[PDB]
Design an enzyme around this catalytic site. Sequence first.
Site, short mmCIF file in Angstrom:
data_model
loop_
_atom_site.label_atom_id
_atom_site.label_comp_id
_atom_site.label_asym_id
_atom_site.label_seq_id
_atom_site.Cartn_x
_atom_site.Cartn_y
_atom_site.Cartn_z
N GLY A 257 -6.05 14.87 -8.61
CA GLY A 257 -6.19 15.18 -7.10
C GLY A 257 -4.49 14.93 -6.53
O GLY A 257 -4.94 16.05 -5.84
N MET A 259 -0.23 12.85 -6.39
CA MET A 259 0.19 12.20 -7.12
C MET A 259 1.39 11.00 -5.82
O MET A 259 1.87 11.99 -4.46
CB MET A 259 1.55 13.02 -8.05
CG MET A 259 1.82 11.81 -9.23
SD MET A 259 1.40 10.82 -9.95
CE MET A 259 2.72 9.02 -9.73
N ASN A 261 3.51 9.87 -5.77
CA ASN A 261 5.88 10.13 -5.79
C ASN A 261 6.47 9.20 -4.47
O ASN A 261 6.15 10.13 -3.70
CB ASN A 261 6.77 11.48 -6.53
CG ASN A 261 5.06 12.33 -6.83
OD1 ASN A 261 5.65 12.01 -8.22
ND2 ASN A 261 4.97 13.20 -7.08
N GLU A 294 -3.01 8.44 -1.73
CA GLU A 294 -1.20 7.98 -2.41
C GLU A 294 -0.85 7.09 -1.65
O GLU A 294 0.32 6.99 -1.82
CB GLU A 294 -1.12 9.60 -2.07
CG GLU A 294 -2.42 10.78 -3.40
CD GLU A 294 -2.83 9.91 -4.36
OE1 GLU A 294 -1.52 9.02 -5.33
OE2 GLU A 294 -3.16 10.52 -4.57
N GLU A 316 -4.84 1.81 -9.95
CA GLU A 316 -5.57 2.74 -9.68
C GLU A 316 -6.79 1.73 -8.82
O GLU A 316 -6.74 2.34 -8.13
CB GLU A 316 -5.77 2.44 -10.66
CG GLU A 316 -4.91 3.91 -11.28
CD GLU A 316 -4.13 4.92 -9.70
OE1 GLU A 316 -5.20 5.22 -9.22
OE2 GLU A 316 -3.47 5.24 -9.77
N1 LIG Z 1 -1.12 8.71 -10.08
C1 LIG Z 1 -2.21 9.22 -9.11
C2 LIG Z 1 -3.97 10.04 -10.16
C3 LIG Z 1 -2.81 11.43 -11.32
C4 LIG Z 1 -2.21 10.64 -12.30
C5 LIG Z 1 -1.58 11.65 -14.14
C6 LIG Z 1 -1.40 13.22 -13.10
C7 LIG Z 1 -1.58 13.08 -12.52
C8 LIG Z 1 -2.36 12.20 -10.84
C9 LIG Z 1 -2.83 8.10 -8.31
O1 LIG Z 1 -4.32 7.57 -8.93
O2 LIG Z 1 -3.04 8.78 -7.03
ZN LIG Z 2 -3.91 5.78 -8.13
#
Ligand SMILES: N[C@@H](Cc1ccccc1)C(=O)O
Ligand SMILES: [Zn+2]
EC number: 3.4.11.2
Length: 866
Positions: A257, A259, A261, A294, A316
């Site tokens: 969905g 990310m 970062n 996010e 999460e």
């Molecule tokens: N880390 C993201 C999910 C995700 C995991 C792996 C790859 C891309 C996206 C989220 O939960 O906000």
């Molecule tokens: Zn998440």
Amino acid sequence: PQAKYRHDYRAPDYQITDIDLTFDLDAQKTVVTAVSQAVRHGASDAPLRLNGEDLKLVSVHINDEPWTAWKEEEGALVISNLPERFTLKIINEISPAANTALEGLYQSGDALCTQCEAEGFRHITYYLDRPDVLARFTTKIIADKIKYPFLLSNGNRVAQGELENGRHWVQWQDPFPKPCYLFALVAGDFDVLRDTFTTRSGREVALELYVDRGNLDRAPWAMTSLKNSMKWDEERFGLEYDLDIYMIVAVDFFNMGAMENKGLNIFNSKYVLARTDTATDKDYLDIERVIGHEYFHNWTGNRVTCRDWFQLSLKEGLTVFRDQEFSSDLGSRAVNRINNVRTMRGLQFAEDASPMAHPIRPDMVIEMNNFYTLTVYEKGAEVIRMIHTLLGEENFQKGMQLYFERHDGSAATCDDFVQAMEDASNVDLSHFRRWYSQSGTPIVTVKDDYNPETEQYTLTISQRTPATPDQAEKQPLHIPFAIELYDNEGKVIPLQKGGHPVNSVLNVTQAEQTFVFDNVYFQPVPALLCEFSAPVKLEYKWSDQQLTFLMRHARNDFSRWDAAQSLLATYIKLNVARHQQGQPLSLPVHVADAFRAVLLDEKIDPALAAEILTLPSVNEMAELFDIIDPIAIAEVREALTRTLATELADELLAIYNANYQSEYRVEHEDIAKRTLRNACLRFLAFGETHLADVLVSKQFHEANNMTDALAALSAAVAAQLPCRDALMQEYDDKWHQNGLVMDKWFILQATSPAANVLETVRGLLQHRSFTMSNPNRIRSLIGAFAGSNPAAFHAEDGSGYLFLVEMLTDLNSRNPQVASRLIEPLIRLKRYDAKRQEKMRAALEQLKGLENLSGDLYEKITKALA
Ligand SMILES: N[C@@H](Cc1ccccc1)C(=O)O
Ligand SMILES: [Zn+2]
Ligand code: NA
Ligand code: NA
């Protein structure tokens, strides 16, 4: 592929404190230079073991000395005989154009972008690719200026220059130490929407949304949602953004969905791009939730991260909880709760009953990408919500504050979070911790007794969790069990015992327990597991009239909807049994009357009415049965729809007309009315053919927004109306150039009740708007068929299984992560009849024998075949 175990966690022998990256970018051959400052914490004779995948090593230097004491092994570079502190320099080459898996550095159309969570950074350079290694990053990017005018990484721009031969460069610095999974790089040509947000304390934040050229008309809602997110996190959690710029990049090619970062989020365009003619109310609300999600990770994931990947739910569960609270505060709390409960009952419970069952904190993982699950996310959130239920808002916020005070700037564990909540609130969560370590869905059985002599009401409550394939041992959990007792007039009876009030959240902690309430002046109608207070299956012997009473009288809108679900469940089960016998639908008059009453109630929130009038999905229906008969379920859902359409025809048309809106607004009151109107349309489509065809075609052609157009198109497909083919062709002709819009059409094709659905789906592999190179297209056609058309997927001839095998044979090589998403309907074989099981087993065995079988698929197949 070797399994890794949570109990094997050990602190790293080496830390990296700072890393300076340089990328000489090119789609065919990118050269990476990585200069890391390292410190040994382990034994003096321990080697440095760096993770790396599909890297072409160029050189290794330690303090600028070419190093001879190293070896490459499978997935690793092992470096021996190091000083206690040193500078490591690695140069290696990678090939973004060759990256069809979309993990590490890859191509999305003309753009280059990264995806590093969970273990993608090791596809970029040799590194300590584990989230307990936090380092301060600087990132230099060098590229062709015409092709890549925007060069983005985490943090702030600290340097820039131009070079010979049409190249340029930009250097970024992010002051916050981070695990490498939070690294991001983007290069390309974009339109950019620029805005600002001023935090409570006065920090000005530059907001920048990067989209493909020509997409600026679809950007404002995402920007609005970002600002909404920022404001809400301040108001609700007291959390402010901590950097100077917030960048979001919308990319078309993305497995998940979005990310989180740090300061440079990368989003699937499905969760960014919206206009009123392209996106539905659902899409708008999903963009809001995902933008929020996010953003919320900035604290719950970034400022405090995960010690290891077994702790994934630490970020999460908590961040899903935060996104739900955000959506619920801004919108309809009842609708949000209802939808989240649907997901838990209809999708998560199925996973917890499957070969892939795991606790929210897993104990064993082969491929970490397999653990981004309904369990980790949605059940994780239910566990956070139980803590909230046990503590209350004030105590919960004190726990959040303690969590941040203790763990800011570090990598933490699920246990650290629980300990913060316990310490801040003084609520004992020792027993509660078992929710993190036990898989499967508890079953809570309730029996009651009313004693007129003593005016006492007694609840006898028992719990058990059935064994799961991963765990033979199960123990009682600490289950917060919320109740409310109603008298004959629909008034709440005060809960008390021995002259003292009793909290309405019962602590169900034993295998069996008795709760006695005094001064119960009338035999109560109970509302049980209020607001789905624990993620459990409830067994209580309801009468129909208790349920219809609750539909009429319950205080919380959620309880009214839930009572309707319990009422429906009885008759869904009845009618599936009847279908198997070749008998038609049977439904008591008083059941239809309960739904008539909802339609004609002038006091009920349209948002609630709409949800009550939305029948459980085929997935929700499946979780009512030990052995799933997917054809019976699909046909009963249709028959129930048709029966209600006939019985309520006049009332449905009246409410449909009453809820007409000339203006289109993305505003919650308007959304509620539209959801009700379209719920009515769904039934009306399954009424008399001529009226249905006229109404549906009229709505499609007269719609001033995609919500209403798509509702009409969906109804035409579902009810196989005369206008269907014309409308479907019109949509294709108008929208074929727009992938996100065509995704909706692929879903409709894939989930069609038509006899020839598989033939159509197969043909659509050649459609102008379809490509195997794009995860969204794959999911909207192939995923929707296998996962959301179980009646066709489970065709008795086995054709659905054969089709999925074909597709997975391709995807196993191309994109294992998408392959693994798509295999899920096949690992559910033990839920099906013997004949189906054998066909599904044969399909799995074929996949097991694939040359170069991915670890992703291997993990699921082996569990399924066990
Ligand atoms: N880390 C993201 C999910 C995700 C995991 C792996 C790859 C891309 C996206 C989220 O939960 O906000
Ligand atoms: Zn998440
Ligand atoms: Na609200
Ligand atoms: Na009873």
